[PDB]
Design a protein around this motif. Structure first.
Motif, PDB file in Angstrom:
ATOM      1  N   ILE A 190       0.862  -1.172   0.000  1.00  9.57           N
ATOM      2  CA  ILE A 190       0.000   0.000   0.000  1.00  9.57           C
ATOM      3  C   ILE A 190       0.900   1.224   0.000  1.00  9.57           C
ATOM      4  CG2 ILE A 190      -1.901   1.155   1.141  1.00  9.57           C
ATOM      5  CD1 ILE A 190      -2.454  -1.527   2.557  1.00  9.57           C
TER       6      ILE A 190
ATOM      7  N   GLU B  23      -7.252  -6.159   3.229  1.00  5.96           N
ATOM      8  CA  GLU B  23      -6.228  -5.952   2.217  1.00  5.96           C
ATOM      9  C   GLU B  23      -4.857  -6.370   2.724  1.00  5.96           C
ATOM     10  OE1 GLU B  23      -4.869  -6.126  -0.645  1.00  5.96           O
ATOM     11  OE2 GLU B  23      -5.937  -4.436  -1.505  1.00  5.96           O
TER      12      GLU B  23
ATOM     13  N   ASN C  79      -4.843 -10.261   2.537  1.00  5.00           N
ATOM     14  CA  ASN C  79      -4.706 -10.723   1.162  1.00  5.00           C
ATOM     15  C   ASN C  79      -3.321 -10.418   0.610  1.00  5.00           C
ATOM     16  OD1 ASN C  79      -4.928  -9.299  -1.788  1.00  5.00           O
ATOM     17  ND2 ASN C  79      -5.861 -11.337  -1.773  1.00  5.00           N
ATOM     18  N   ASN C  80      -2.732  -9.293   1.015  1.00  3.55           N
ATOM     19  CA  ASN C  80      -1.433  -8.917   0.477  1.00  3.55           C
ATOM     20  C   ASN C  80      -0.308  -9.708   1.125  1.00  3.55           C
ATOM     21  OD1 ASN C  80      -2.351  -7.171  -1.431  1.00  3.55           O
ATOM     22  ND2 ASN C  80      -1.792  -5.292  -0.345  1.00  3.55           N
TER      23      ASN C  80
ATOM     24  N   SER D 136     -14.863 -11.845   0.436  1.00  6.63           N
ATOM     25  CA  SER D 136     -13.682 -11.248  -0.170  1.00  6.63           C
ATOM     26  C   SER D 136     -12.636 -12.266  -0.602  1.00  6.63           C
ATOM     27  CB  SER D 136     -13.049 -10.254   0.799  1.00  6.63           C
ATOM     28  OG  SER D 136     -11.673 -10.102   0.521  1.00  6.63           O
TER      29      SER D 136
ATOM     30  N   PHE E  52      -8.322  -1.447  -3.960  1.00  4.52           N
ATOM     31  CA  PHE E  52      -7.981  -2.611  -3.160  1.00  4.52           C
ATOM     32  C   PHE E  52      -8.525  -3.894  -3.774  1.00  4.52           C
ATOM     33  CE2 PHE E  52      -7.305  -0.517   1.251  1.00  4.52           C
ATOM     34  CZ  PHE E  52      -6.026  -0.195   0.876  1.00  4.52           C
TER      35      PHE E  52
ATOM     36  N   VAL F 298      -9.692  -6.282  -2.074  1.00  5.46           N
ATOM     37  CA  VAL F 298     -10.842  -6.724  -1.296  1.00  5.46           C
ATOM     38  C   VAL F 298     -11.960  -5.690  -1.332  1.00  5.46           C
ATOM     39  CG1 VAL F 298      -9.195  -7.958   0.129  1.00  5.46           C
ATOM     40  CG2 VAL F 298     -10.096  -5.764   0.898  1.00  5.46           C
TER      41      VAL F 298
ATOM     42  N   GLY G  76      -7.852  -3.518  -8.645  1.00  5.37           N
ATOM     43  CA  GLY G  76      -7.065  -3.633  -7.435  1.00  5.37           C
ATOM     44  C   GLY G  76      -5.596  -3.844  -7.725  1.00  5.37           C
TER      45      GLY G  76
ATOM     46  N   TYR H  99      -1.320  -3.953  -6.449  1.00  4.55           N
ATOM     47  CA  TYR H  99      -0.251  -4.103  -5.474  1.00  4.55           C
ATOM     48  C   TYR H  99       0.919  -3.255  -5.945  1.00  4.55           C
ATOM     49  CZ  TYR H  99       3.065  -6.293  -2.292  1.00  4.55           C
ATOM     50  OH  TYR H  99       3.995  -6.526  -1.305  1.00  4.55           O
TER      51      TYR H  99
END
Ligand SMILES: Nc1ncnc2c1ncn2[C@@H]1O[C@H](COP(=O)(O)OP(=O)(O)OP(=O)(O)O)[C@@H](O)[C@H]1O
Ligand SMILES: Nc1ncnc2c1ncn2[C@@H]1O[C@H](COP(=O)(O)OP(=O)(O)O)[C@@H](O)[C@H]1O
Lengths: 179, 11, 502, 481, 72, 145, 245, 125, 145
Positions: free
Chosen positions: D138, D169, D172-173, D204, D420, D422, D431, D433
């Motif tokens: 992020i 997030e 998930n990341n 999600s 994001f 999610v 979304g 990264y």
């Protein structure tokens, strides 16, 4: 527990480790009335009285009443550590721990009149089956406060109970009030 | 009642 | 009060069995009622107050409360595997730690037992933990410097050998950069440093010890480390074992330094221990004995007289404040105990002035007795000019008398602020400090650029260290700012200025 | 562990006293199940934890469940171990209480591996002394308030800002970027919010419901309906589940705690019940030790690393209260979540200036990263000071350096947004990264005059500054067309 | 024990008989239009609520799975 | 006592549509003293409950009844507890009331302000007037829409 | 404290000499009494002090008197904890003392040394029959202007000096001159400042404050009054300041 | 207070006439209980009162009631200690009163006698 | 402690004409800690004694001696304890003095003043100068009148 419990259990254990349980029961029932009759209880109380002037007359009471020596040791230690003011409570609490160690559950049967003892031994059988007590020392009191029959309080002090003299008409009142 | 005094002073 | 702890049934049965006899349980005590940082022991008739006792699990204890029938010992660890009814043994020894010259380079867990992983430490057992402090005839007035390596400290808050100087500030405001800076600056001097970490997270203790090992400071440093997951007894007792370890070197004519990181955390551990022992607490729930807790610990930092070998111990206790609350309980206690403080400030730390000494509210009650002749002669003008800056920057947003004040504040103050700031873990020798204060407060660094001051000063520092070996000799020989060093420094800074203009 | 059978001696609220045989009684911090009896007509057992040894064959426990319907003389079973919870990949995508029982009604979990929740921290030798930077992907968090691997992070955002989307997030990341897993520990979790969170985690894709054990999170729930014993120890249960994933599997674990203030609150409650004298503002006397014995097992060993992201509640909005003051002795970084930024659509709603970090130092992040982050902070602060003047004068009656500052600041403030993975499920954008390298390379370009001829709505809701230039070209095609 | 009333006529020697019940109330749809005290008994004096079921006073909350999301 | 209040308030649930879709909405009332919300029982019930609806004696004596403090009251359920008709007007009402709360200090200098600022101030002080209600007169959802 | 008091009392009684008794921190006497009284098995007082605090103070302080034989002039430091003047130990010391001197953290941090607060520091010897009428009137007027200054301090804190009237701003300027002239360099603090200590007699102090309050010395800097004595030196320092410029 | 209340109970119930019951400081009726409560072996409550403050106040305050056969209008004086309206003894009376009449010291300090606080003294009529 | 001071003070009475009309007048002295009337013992005694006299330290330093803080000090007996001359001349005096003190407080932050306002302020200041005394310099009844 309590101070009474922690001293009574100690005396009952040192009575179990060297088997004198009947001799110590006789000894504690003697000492209960020896320490009743408040002059002597006050005298072993009243902390102004010195421990030597206590111990002299105490060993005299030992010699006269012919008590077992380890119960005499217990009373000497109660003079030593100032827990003699609770000797009445210790002696009265000794019975419950004696019945716990000796497998007995004591169970009153409070009925109006004297029983014919065949059904009283039946109540003894019932209370000893239902609790696992080896030899119940059943007691009764002639008390006319009941209406018809008998009832038995067993367990720890009187904790469990079955009541058939008056509870019938008590349930009848509970029906008639209807609330 | 001193804390309400300080609260009102801060306000 | 009608109940005791010794009134369990086994003790009364053993009393009833034989009333009159001879031999009591001499060193055999049976634990009963293992509580919360305490354990009560029936037995130990001949134990001493302050005696170490040993449990079956292996836990050490200390006989504190010696009542009539039972002694109450305080657990020196987690008393988890103390089986109820297990035996306790006295040791005959009042609380001690083995001391030696071989503790240098090891990490300790407040019991003189290494958490280092490098094997045991040979020693000759002595040095009671609660040693008595020196008397009045034993010590001497402070007269020699303990160079910390920071320009601001060494210039305006001079610390001498044998002086208790407090480092008070907020969280993440310094005090550990300052403490480790002072420890790392002791490379050439014969100073035995001691670092006590009382309540730090174990990662910060790791950072400090690896910085020490990397920069070479563990050849004269011991680390007594109590992490945040430790019992309150060990956090309470760690600075006393640190002080005993340092006193071993102190009473053998060697100069020592000791840093008690977070004495407020030791006071918090003492608060937890007293509250679990149900003692009546005073203000902020502190036991009331917290002043004595800190004073009998800090009173050991002395400067012993010539008959006692002329040893010393400098103490740099660290106290955290809540939002800069100097008028709290524990900060005022340590201020009333020590010989001066060093105020770090969160506004100047977060605003970039990185050694964030709040100079106008920090003192040192040794002063010129601590400083050498050179630093006195050079830094008088420095503290004067910084004093003037201190009211100018506050009261005057631009100025009164805007022309001379621009020649006052812009020339002196705002460049001395960049002159005093100093990076993490980078000490300065006293020659570089004298030189840097001279180049600033005389009036020579009055026409630079506000981001080029730092680069000019570092390059001039290396230049004078490389092309003027005789200035360092004449400052390291007499420690006095003679006219010859002055003149050669003047022409050297002209040389360096014309070199750096390009 | 054997026939060490106790009998209840006292029942005073959720605090019990148990009596034992004279030689065999449990240690402190030892589980004991109360073989109790429900009034309805079935047996039901109650788990307790020893807190204190009291003397003549008697301990004092604290119940993890309710003590209603318990008689004196119930059989208490000593267990010889602390509270043992199931650990491993079998605890993934499932909900647990403080005792490690499943409460998600999916079925039973196989106790093939059970670790105790009471455990000493890693050794001083086994600790890792490196200062690594946890990369969340992020942009705002990585650039302006960097995270530490093995450190703790405090969430200070109120209710209604993008907090739950943020932790989803992060889960998930850490699953997709690194090989890590996550462990959510709900200290004092409201039950309907717990159900909402579990549903949103199923939706999600974090909790793969079509196939459990492919999931990226383990949920432990200590609810408000539960006694103060459970609500205190649920953080230790969650930390044990995370410590297994660190120790045995050597992953980078992410341990999410809910309000660590309710951990302190349950601790003060159990100390008031056990009768100990209160500390300064009424907290438990073992406040700092109770907190540290938890926070010291969130470290980085030579094997893996647990990074904790703990929501922090400040009572009466002051940071000098003992629970915030003792929590902040362990926090390495801090992210504040902005109601205003959540309003004006700058999700993730992290405040850039009020979020701090001790990782943001030249020695740790590189002089380049430090200088660019400081320049971004100066730019945003100058814009915040200048908003009133732009409201009065306007952008025209400013100066040129101030005007370019204002424009670059609007672009930066919109670049701190992110779509994001999610939050895509209702927003639609695919979304992104964004690693730290692309973050600093994009902010260098947005700060020096290389990308100033672009619309402000071109940097908004993109990652990876090449996408900002591409969306800018598309927004210009919208004009050419 | 805590008394749900005034302990004036308690005797210091009187016998307390346990009932083996845990604090229930009679509950039915016949409570609508009624005012009651903490024993679910009328205080408005309009008769008596004929309730056939029963529920404990302290009954556990609905768990995670017996809940939904609030939308209504 | 936290366990006391939480065991009771956590009984207010919305069931799971296989247990019957029924629900129980708890509306507990808590009295603060001198507005000390940092008191023990108010902090407990605030930590336990979903949202809060703060009332003010200043707003009450100042005429606005019911004296709801909207700026400090929260609802953690949010707009999911509204019908689709309500959200459309609720968004604009919230934004305009927030702008009025921002510009409330500028009311004494309303004369020397921009026309947009005067518009926001007047819209605020006549949006405050429709949030007044008399006791026991509850508006239906269509009337308030 | 008791053994020092006994040594002094022997000189007072038998030798009939006028004794001085300098005691440093009679508060720590109270504090150690509290420390032992917690372990002595006593319920504590308000802030955890000993229940016998007033009597423990009085049994020591009532032996420090001036009988017909001698006189014990005792000067005692009394620490206040956390700068709390309402604390039980100083609040019980106040009743035994007959000439107090309260020091201020604000005045200390402002460099005004000694940090004596002029308005809280009272005495029972400031009476016109004991110190004359001129000293009494000048002390009264000094305290009156300092009290007016302390009154309007909060208004001039938020707003500033620019909003006062002419007489109120003259009062402010004279109060700043007074609070600067109250400071002095000490002989024992010659290591902290330099510029050695000045012994300032009584009549010189009275004349200096008469000159400040009279209106003569209204046209000279305040920094001429800071850290001087015998206001001739304030005049000399103002001359030096306007000459060195 | 219970004696005077009993005398008013008789005049309301048996004689069936409108009784006017003036009470002086009912703070003293609670203060006497807080004085004896420590000696009664009860453990102390919040700031120093008995644990049974609300029930002790409530019994007396609930016996005062217009009963549809006669009425009792009761005007009660409640000493507020240290002008602290959030003290427990007045705080537990605020629930039992119909029209509360809070008196200010800031108005007495000016001479606005009767110093009845207009914005604090509310009423349910 | 309330009972301690109450049974001590209530002895100070005025006996009736059957008991001899003897009287004991009490003048207790309670010392406050830094203006904490909210302390326990001051607010216990203030509710026992008939009136009170508040001697401020701010007035004492300002030179208003005696330092009576008229406005917060009362006399619960009132003008019944005064000769008829003093009832005639100083009956409405304390209430008007409190009203003047309020008026002079409010006149600080009012720029322009009336004429009757200025005359009221001038009379109030004249009285504030009248009410001073040196110690042990007592005025008789007719001097006071
Ligand atoms: N002089 C300095 N120059 C550069 N960086 C510094 C300096 N002093 C401190 N820092 C940085 O600031 C951070 C906090 O500093 P420090 O470790 O000295 O405070 P601290 O003792 O950890 O505070 P606390 O432990 O009370 O939270 C450290 O990570 C350090 O890198
Ligand atoms: N990155 C994002 N993109 C779009 N919408 C978002 C984003 N983050 C949060 N939101 C919206 O903001 C709201 C925040 O609610 P949430 O964070 O779940 O509340 P809580 O913090 O109480 O759990 C959500 O309803 C979500 O729809």
């Amino acid at each position: 527990d309590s101070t009474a419990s922690r001293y009574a259990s100690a005396l009952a254990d040192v009575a179990d480790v060297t088997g004198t349980l009947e001799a110590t029961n006789s000894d504690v029932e003697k000492l209960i009335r020896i320490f009743s009759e408040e002059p002597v209880y006050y005298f072993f109380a009243n902390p102004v009285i010195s421990i030597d002037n206590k111990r002299s007359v105490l060993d005299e009471i030992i010699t006269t009443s012919g008590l077992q020596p380890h119960t005499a040791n217990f009373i000497n230690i109660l003079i030593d550590s100032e827990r003699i003011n609770l000797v009445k409570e210790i002696l009265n609490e000794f019975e419950d721990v004696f019945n716990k160690i000796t497998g007995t559950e004591v169970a009153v049967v409070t009925s109006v009149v004297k029983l014919e003892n065949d059904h009283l031994a039946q109540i003894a059988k019932g209370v000893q089956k239902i609790t696992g007590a080896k030899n119940v020392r059943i007691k009764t009191v002639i008390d006319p406060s009941l209406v018809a029959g008998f009832t038995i309080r067993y367990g720890n002090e009187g904790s469990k109970l079955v009541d058939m003299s008056v509870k019938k008409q008590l349930e009848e009142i509970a029906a008639q009030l209807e609330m | 009642a001193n804390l309400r005094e300080l609260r009102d002073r801060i306000g | 009060a009608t109940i005791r702890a010794d009134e369990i049934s086994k003790i009364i049965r053993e009393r009833i069995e034989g009333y009159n006899r001879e031999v009591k349980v001499v060193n055999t005590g049976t634990v009963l009622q293992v509580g919360d940082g305490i354990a009560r022991i029936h037995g130990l008739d001949e134990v001493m107050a302050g005696e170490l006792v040993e449990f079956e699990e292996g836990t050490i204890g200390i006989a504190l409360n010696l009542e009539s029938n039972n002694v109450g010992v305080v657990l020196m660890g987690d008393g988890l595997m103390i089986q109820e009814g297990s035996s306790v043994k006295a040791t005959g020894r009042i609380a001690q730690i083995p001391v030696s010259e071989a503790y240098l380079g090891r990490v300790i867990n407040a019991l003189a037992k290494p958490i280092d992983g490098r094997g045991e430490i040979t020693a000759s057992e002595s040095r009671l933990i609660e040693s008595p402090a020196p008397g009045i005839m034993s010590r001497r007035s402070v007269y020699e410097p303990l160079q910390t390596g920071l320009i601001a400290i060494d210039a305006m808050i001079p610390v001498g050998r044998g002086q208790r100087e407090l480092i008070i500030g907020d969280r993440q405001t310094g005090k550990t950069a300052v403490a480790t800076d002072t420890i790392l600056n002791q490379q050439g001097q014969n100073v035995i440093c001691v670092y006590v970490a009382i309540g730090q997270k174990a990662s910060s203790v790791a950072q400090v010890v690896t910085n020490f090992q990397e920069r070479g400071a563990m050849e004269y440093t011991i680390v007594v480390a109590e992490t945040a997951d430790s019992p309150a007894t060990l956090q309470y007792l760690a600075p006393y074992t640190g002080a005993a370890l340092a006193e071993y070197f102190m009473y053998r004519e060697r100069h020592t330094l000791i840093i008690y990181d977070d004495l407020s955390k030791q006071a918090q551990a003492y608060r937890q221990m007293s509250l679990l022992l149900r003692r009546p607490p005073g203000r902020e729930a502190y036991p009331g004995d917290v002043f004595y807790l800190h004073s009998r610990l800090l009173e050991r930092a002395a400067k012993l007289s010539s008959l006692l070998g002329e040893g010393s111990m400098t103490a740099l206790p660290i106290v955290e404040t809540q939002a800069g609350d100097v008028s709290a309980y524990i900060p005022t206690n340590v201020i009333s105990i020590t010989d001066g403080q060093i105020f770090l400030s969160a506004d100047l730390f977060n605003a970039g002035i990185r050694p964030a000494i709040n100079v106008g509210i920090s003192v040192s009650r040794v002063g010129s007795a601590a400083q050498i002749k050179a630093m006195k002669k050079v830094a008088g003008k420095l503290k004067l000019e910084l004093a003037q800056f201190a009211e100018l920057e506050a009261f005057a947003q631009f100025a009164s008398d805007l022309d001379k004040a621009t020649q006052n504040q812009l020339a002196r103050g705002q460049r001395l602020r960049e002159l005093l700031k100093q990076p993490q873990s980078a000490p300065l020798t006293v020659e570089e400090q004298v030189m840097t204060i001279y180049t600033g407060t005389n009036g020579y660094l009055d026409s630079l650029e506000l981001d080029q001051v730092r680069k000019y000063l570092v390059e001039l520092r290396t230049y004078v260290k490389t092309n003027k070996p005789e200035f360092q000799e004449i400052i390291s020989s007499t420690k006095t700012f003679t006219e010859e060093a002055e003149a050669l420094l003047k022409e050297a800074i002209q040389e360096q200025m014309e070199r750096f203009l390009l | 562990e054997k026939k060490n059978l106790g009998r209840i001696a006292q029942i005073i609220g959720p605090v019990l006293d148990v009596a034992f045989p004279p030689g065999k009684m449990p240690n402190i911090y030892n589980a004991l199940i109360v073989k109790g009896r429900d009034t309805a007509g079935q047996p039901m057992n109650v788990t307790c934890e020893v807190q204190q040894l009291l003397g003549n064959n008697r301990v004092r426990a604290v119940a993890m469940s309710a003590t209603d319907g318990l008689t004196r003389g119930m059989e208490v079973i000593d267990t010889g171990a602390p509270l043992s919870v199931p650990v491993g990949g079998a605890t993934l995508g499932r909900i647990f209480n403080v005792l490690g029982e499943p409460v998600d009604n999916l079925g039973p979990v196989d106790t093939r591996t059970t670790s105790p929740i009471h455990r000493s921290a890693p050794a001083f030798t086994q600790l890792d002394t490196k200062l690594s930077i946890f990369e969340t992907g992020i942009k705002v968090v990585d650039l302006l308030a960097p995270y530490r691997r093995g450190g703790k992070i405090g969430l200070f955002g109120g209710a209604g800002v993008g907090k739950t989307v943020l932790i989803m997030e992060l889960i998930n990341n850490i699953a997709k970027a690194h090989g890590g897993v996550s462990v959510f520990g709900g200290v004092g979790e409201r039950t309907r919010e717990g159900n909402d969170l579990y549903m949103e985690m199923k939706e999600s894709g974090v909790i793969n419901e079509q196939n459990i054990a492919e999931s990226k999170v383990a949920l432990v729930y200590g609810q408000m309906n539960e006694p103060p014993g459970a609500r205190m120890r649920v953080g230790l249960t969650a930390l044990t589940m995370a410590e297994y994933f660190r120790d045995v599997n050597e992953q980078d674990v992410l341990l999410f705690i809910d309000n660590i203030f309710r951990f302190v609150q349950a601790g003060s409650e159990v100390s008031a019940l056990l009768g100990r004298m209160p500390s300064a503002v009424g907290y438990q006397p073992t406040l700092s030790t109770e907190m540290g014995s938890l926070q010291e097992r969130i470290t980085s060993t030579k094997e893996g690393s647990i990074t904790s992201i703990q929501a922090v509640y400040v009572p009466a909005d002051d940071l000098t209260d003992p629970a915030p003051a003792t929590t902040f002795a362990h926090l390495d970084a801090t992210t504040v979540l902005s109601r205003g930024l959540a309003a004006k659509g700058i999700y993730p709603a992290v405040d850039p200036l009020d979020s701090t970090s001790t990782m943001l130092q030249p020695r740790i992040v590189g002089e380049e990263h430090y200088e660019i982050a400081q320049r971004v902070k100066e730019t945003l602060q100058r814009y915040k000071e200048l908003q009133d003047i732009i409201a009065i004068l306007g952008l025209d009656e400013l100066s040129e350096e101030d005007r370019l500052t204002v424009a670059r600041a609007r672009k930066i403030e919109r670049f701190l947004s992110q779509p994001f993975f999610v939050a895509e499920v209702f927003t639609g954008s695919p979304g992104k990264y964004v690693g730290l390298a692309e973050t600093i390379r994009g902010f260098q370009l947005i700060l020096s005059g290389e990308l100033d001829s672009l619309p402000e709505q071109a940097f908004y809701l993109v990652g990876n500054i090449d996408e900002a230039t591409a969306k800018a070209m598309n927004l210009e095609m919208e004009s050419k067309l």
